[PDB]
């Protein structure tokens, strides 16, 4: 009946732009609720977003400091869509060169490593070529590290300064997007729509 979207609002960085973007896209559908999450004191969400802009360690810090780790884990187990965005995508992994000792959410085996290009951070627009569900097109990036996981979990791929990296990852109902869906104009509105659309299927 009611579609329950949740966005972790604690993590480092501007989370209001994703909230506005997600709210815009959810207007095409009916009976959708979107709530900013900063604590585990809630009923599982059908669609949970782990966003964030900043340093890998800080992200895992906010998540722990606010006792949200196990909350995210329950969503994975209960088969609800969990999707990381920007920093969120990287947090889906085990380790990151950015946070030496720090361990990630480890939902997908793999590692976040620094891009090999001298010209960092990677800004501008770039082509993302998805394997199957999301719109192929140019999306807006702003990042310094990128995921390194198994071929079987790569959802979308992009090339930056001669280096091909996963701009989108996937593992069951766990989704991850490296680029900013908000700030990615039209195609970005379309991407967020497909994410809702996927969490909507009762079939």
Curated annotation (Swiss-Prot):
The active site is at 86 (nucleophile), 180, 182. Pathway: Amino-acid biosynthesis; L-histidine biosynthesis; L-histidine from 5-phospho-alpha-D-ribose 1-diphosphate: step 5/9. Activated by the binding of either IGP or PRFAR to the active site of HisF. Its main location: cytoplasm. It catalyses: 5-[(5-phospho-1-deoxy-D-ribulos-1-ylimino)methylamino]-1-(5-phospho-beta-D-ribosyl)imidazole-4-carboxamide + L-glutamine = D-erythro-1-(imidazol-4-yl)glycerol 3-phosphate + 5-amino-1-(5-phospho-beta-D-ribosyl)imidazole-4-carboxamide + L-glutamate + H(+); L-glutamine + H2O = L-glutamate + NH4(+). SUPFAM superfamilies: Class I glutamine amidotransferase-like. Its EC number is 4.3.2.10, 3.5.1.2. It comes from the Bacteria. Gene3D superfamilies: 3.40.50.880. It is found in: Cytoplasm. Disulfide bonds: none annotated. One of its GO terms (cellular component) is cytoplasm. Residues 4-203 form the Glutamine amidotransferase type-1 domain. One of its GO terms (biological process) is L-histidine biosynthetic process. Keywords: Amino-acid biosynthesis, Cytoplasm, Glutamine amidotransferase, Histidine biosynthesis, Hydrolase, Lyase. Heterodimer of HisH and HisF. IGPS catalyzes the conversion of PRFAR and glutamine to IGP, AICAR and glutamate. The HisH subunit catalyzes the hydrolysis of glutamine to glutamate and ammonia as part of the synthesis of IGP and AICAR. The resulting ammonia molecule is channeled to the active site of HisF. NCBIfam families: IMP_synth_hisH (TIGR01855). This is Imidazole glycerol phosphate synthase subunit HisH.
